[PDB]
């Protein structure tokens, strides 16, 4: 049983013929609500999907989760060669072509694909990420929801290079099994923007889950 998150070891990653470039269609993706869950920040969506790459069908977008740590240099779930990023976004997707809902897809072997976009604290103010950062005033208390009163295009939070690692693991809560698509190239944000998440209430200083052992029989693939 291979749990997530893991430390991806680059020397152990292997090739596969099906890892073409991943086509990401978020042109028709809009956000709906945004939540403080007591542990982390969730942003729900309606519309958008991913295709191409190694996927047989398309998987539609569900939600976005955001993770962070106590300090700026060390806050991601996943690691690459024992190196952590400042934070991590998890875009959840599910197989609508085969199955009738998200909670239905959570029970199947091939139900879920989670994309991982890393955050790195530089001195650039991310104009697209700010529109999420602004909404955090609504959801200060634990277990609160608010509507996303802001125009937002999800495409603009994609990294500049979409080379990727991919492995089978789980969801972060160990609810279900899921395929991961992890982009090593992080998007750049300011410390101000990330430190605003740390003012949320349960003070939520950090919410990353510690890594599990990469098993000897688990394969990690490079694109």
């Amino acid at each position: 049983q291979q749990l997530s998150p893991i430390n991806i070891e680059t020397k152990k990653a292997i090739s596969n013929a099906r890892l073409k470039p991943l086509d990401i269609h978020y042109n028709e993706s809009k956000p709906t609500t945004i939540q403080n869950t007591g542990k982390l920040v969730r942003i729900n969506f309606k519309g958008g999907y991913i295709s191409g790459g190694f996927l047989p069908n398309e998987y539609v977008l569900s939600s976005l989760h955001i993770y962070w740590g106590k300090e700026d240099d060390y806050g991601s779930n996943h690691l690459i060669d024992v190196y952590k990023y400042s934070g991590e976004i998890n875009l959840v997707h599910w197989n609508k072509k085969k199955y009738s809902s998200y909670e239905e897809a959570k029970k199947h072997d091939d139900g879920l694909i989670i994309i991982s976009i890393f955050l790195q604290v530089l001195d650039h103010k991310n104009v697209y990420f700010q529109k999420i950062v602004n909404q955090l005033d609504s959801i200060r208390s634990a277990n609160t929801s608010a509507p996303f009163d802001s125009v937002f295009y999800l495409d603009n939070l994609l990294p500049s290079k979409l080379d990727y690692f991919t492995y089978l693991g789980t969801t972060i809560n160990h609810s279900a099994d899921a395929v991961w698509i992890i982009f090593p190239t992080p998007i750049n944000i300011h410390s101000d923007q990330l430190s605003k998440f740390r003012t949320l209430l349960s003070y939520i200083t950090e919410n990353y889950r510690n890594p599990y052992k990469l098993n000897d029989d688990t394969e990690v693939y490079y694109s």
Partner: antibody
Amino acid sequence: LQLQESGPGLVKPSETLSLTCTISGDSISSNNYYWGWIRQPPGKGLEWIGSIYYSGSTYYNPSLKSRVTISVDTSKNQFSLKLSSVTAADTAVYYCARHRRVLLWFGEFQLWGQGTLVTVSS
Amino acid sequence: SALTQPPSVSGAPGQRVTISCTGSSSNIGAGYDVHWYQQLPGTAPKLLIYGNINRPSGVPDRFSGSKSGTSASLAITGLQAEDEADYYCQSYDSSLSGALFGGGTQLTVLG
């Protein structure tokens, strides 16, 4: 790790063939693998019947989809085949085997059982 | 959704024998890998090649795998008498949504 089929040699025609594979030396509840049944009629080729994930999900051969059922029992480290409405074409050696999950499809059949002969006859 | 193999091949001991596995755009040509198995009479299939080219521990160096386009090939370089067996290519097929075996090739060692 070992796989071990268990089940009757003989089943009467138009009735349900029933087999059970028992895994030992390792756990069946692992998300890296599927658990498959394969058959070989005497002097003929291998045919994949179907496969099952630890948590329940099934994938069957579309030739035999309507007659085939597979199930798992993670508490007893075993999985089962039931094949209904059986004719002389279903007389075969039946193999249980562990194969690899590769992302969103299947890889190789790494370990196989001995095989058990089931004969269709009145 | 079919993998074609020639029904029989033969060679003398120490010769190079190849066995082809012709597939389609729904299996080999879609990048799903090809795996090979050896079967001695009355025993279970045994994994010989996986991921087009890889050998498990125990399989000797003379066994070899390749793939290009819609076709894949098992080569045996230096036939031994113990290599008399049935050989099966195997892959995944997207329209089947599951595993797919070829018809098999009976290998006879002459001489």
